[PDB]
């Protein structure tokens, strides 16, 4: 049928009755319920406005940059290790996205990933360099990781991967929800292990929080081309959006800039609000 609209206003006259929607108590844990038809005389207003952009699917429906990886394809032997870059799977690298995801304690969604590539000659002297193809592969936790760009694990017999030619449409892939729980948690008030009597006098300092608990493996990105006399700096940006998303148990937004992957604060930025001269100053 018609997408349901927000509350319409019924007309009303003055009230001298003993019903009093104007007075309440919030001590009960309930919010106030009063609307203009309870408080003032009103006219009828037809309300057809729709809360669509506030649906969670819409709220989380745009791809955000998550990470930027630096790769260099170079002929200098001392730079060979820079031919590839292994990144931990995470969304904690960029603050604008974390801010919205962390609104919910729990969530379930499928993930869309895309990549954006760009390249330049970081060196003083440029020269002819052929079009590079990039290999993006996922290495699940426990899967072997390459020690080098030409490491045999890039055979990728099981590990899924993408080969992208620079300049063609930015690559894209869908990832189904991969939790081992019935939801991803955005928080974890606990420890990976329970230290027992004896052992370490006061352990847990190295394993408290979500940062310890959920290991999603790594994404390995290599250049696939052998080196050239002129070298290239290549930047890859990883973008993400939840798709087909549900959330539970809402939380306050963060006021303090994040001190990395934990919930930690920096002493230099714990003052989120600006002052106003007084209560009576507009």
């Amino acid at each position: 049928s018609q997408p349901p609209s927000t509350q319409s206003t019924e007309a009303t006259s003055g009230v001298n009755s003993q019903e009093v929607p104007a007075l309440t108590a919030v001590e009960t844990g309930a919010s106030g319920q009063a609307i203009p038809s309870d408080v003032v005389e009103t006219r009828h207003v037809v309300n057809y406005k729709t809360r669509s952009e506030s649906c969670l699917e819409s709220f989380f429906g745009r791809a955000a940059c998550v990470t930027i990886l630096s790769l260099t394809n170079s002929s200098k032997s001392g730079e060979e290790k820079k031919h590839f870059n292994i990144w931990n799977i995470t969304y904690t690298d960029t603050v604008q996205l974390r801010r919205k995801l962390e609104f919910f304690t729990y969530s379930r969604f499928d993930l869309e990933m895309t990549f954006v590539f760009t390249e330049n000659y970081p060196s003083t002297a440029s020269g002819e360099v052929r079009n590079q193809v990039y290999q993006i592969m996922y290495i699940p936790p426990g899967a072997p990781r390459p020690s080098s760009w030409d490491d045999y694990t890039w055979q990728s017999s099981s590990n899924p991967s993408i080969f992208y030619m620079y300049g063609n449409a930015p690559p894209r892939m869908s990832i189904p929800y991969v939790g081992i729980a019935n939801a991803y948690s955005h928080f974890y008030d606990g420890f990976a292990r329970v230290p027992l009597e004896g052992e370490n006098t006061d352990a847990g300092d190295t394993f408290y929080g979500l940062v310890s608990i959920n290991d999603f493996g790594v994404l390995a990105v290599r250049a696939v081309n052998r080196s050239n006399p002129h070298t290239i700096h290549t930047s890859v940006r990883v973008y993400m959006k939840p798709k087909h998303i549900r959330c539970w148990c809402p939380r306050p937004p963060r006021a303090v800039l994040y001190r990395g992957e934990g919930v930690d604060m920096i002493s230099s930025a714990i003052l989120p609000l600006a002052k106003v001269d007084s209560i009576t100053t507009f």
């Binding site: 009960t28 844990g29 974890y188 027992l196 352990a203 006021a255 920096i266």
Partner: protein, 258 residues
């Protein structure tokens, strides 16, 4: 009337003449795991009355300089009754809770306490040297619980409480403004109207059941939203009962680090 209540669980009864109604978080009454959502195969244990008792925590004093108090919920009950014992006998468990908070003050007292139940009450570490560097012991204060401060003084290394949580009150110890804490199930005890508040919560996790020794599903936060004042010190007593509990995976007796 809504103001007068009696609640019973197991063998213990709580009564009050000045209740702020009652809250059931999300409108969802605590329950047991259905066969359709069962995760472990092991036949469950349902201790019923042996653990579903209202237990008291050591009370705290509300002073005019207090900034707040906090507890980890399954942790605070670990020290008592069969609930506390079963958590060291089984790998997995589930528990909903009924939390009753009372603050007895005269009509001449003013001030108010916000009581919030927060899923996943993860707190910041009090150091700039490491991320989330908090030890098991200092993250799990049990029956005693912890408190809040109004200053942030992260420590050098582990010289003092460098493995303990930061606890700014205005930011709830985590970097979020306290003024938005009202998103969480909550009640306020205004000394002008009520002397108590009761909140019932379901088990909340990404799982149907989890290990109580590793994961604190809920925490309790109490704040002096309106300052205590009088014409003062007022004790606050927090009484908690688990409900609809289940245990699985009988294991070796677990004894956590002291």
């Amino acid at each position: 009337s809504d103001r007068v209540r009696q609640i019973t669980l197991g063998n213990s009864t709580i009564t009050t003449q000045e209740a702020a109604n009652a809250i059931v978080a999300y409108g969802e009454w605590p329950t047991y795991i259905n066969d359709s959502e069962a995760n472990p195969v092991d036949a469950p244990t349902e201790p019923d009355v042996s653990s579903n008792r209202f237990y008291t925590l050591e009370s705290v004093s509300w002073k005019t300089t207090s900034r707040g108090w906090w507890w980890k919920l399954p942790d605070c009950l670990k020290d008592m009754g069969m609930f506390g014992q079963n958590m060291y006998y089984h790998y997995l468990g589930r528990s909903g809770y009924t939390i009753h908070v009372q603050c007895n003050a005269s009509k001449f007292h003013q001030g108010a306490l916000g009581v919030f139940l927060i899923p996943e009450f993860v707190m910041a570490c009090n150091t700039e040297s490491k991320t989330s560097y908090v030890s098991y012991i200092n993250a799990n204060p049990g029956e005693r619980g912890g408190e809040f401060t109004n200053t942030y003084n992260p420590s050098n290394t582990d010289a003092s409480e460098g493995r303990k949580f930061a606890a700014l009150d205005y930011l709830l110890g985590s970097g979020v403004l306290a003024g938005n804490a009202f998103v969480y199930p909550h009640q306020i005890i205004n000394l002008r109207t009520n002397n108590s508040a009761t909140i019932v919560v379901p088990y909340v996790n990404s799982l149907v059941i989890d290990c109580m020794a590793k994961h604190n599903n809920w925490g309790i936060v109490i704040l002096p939203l309106a300052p205590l004042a009088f014409a003062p010190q007022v004790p606050i007593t927090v009484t908690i009962a688990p409900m609809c509990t289940e245990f699985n995976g009988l294991r070796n007796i677990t004894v956590p680090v002291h």
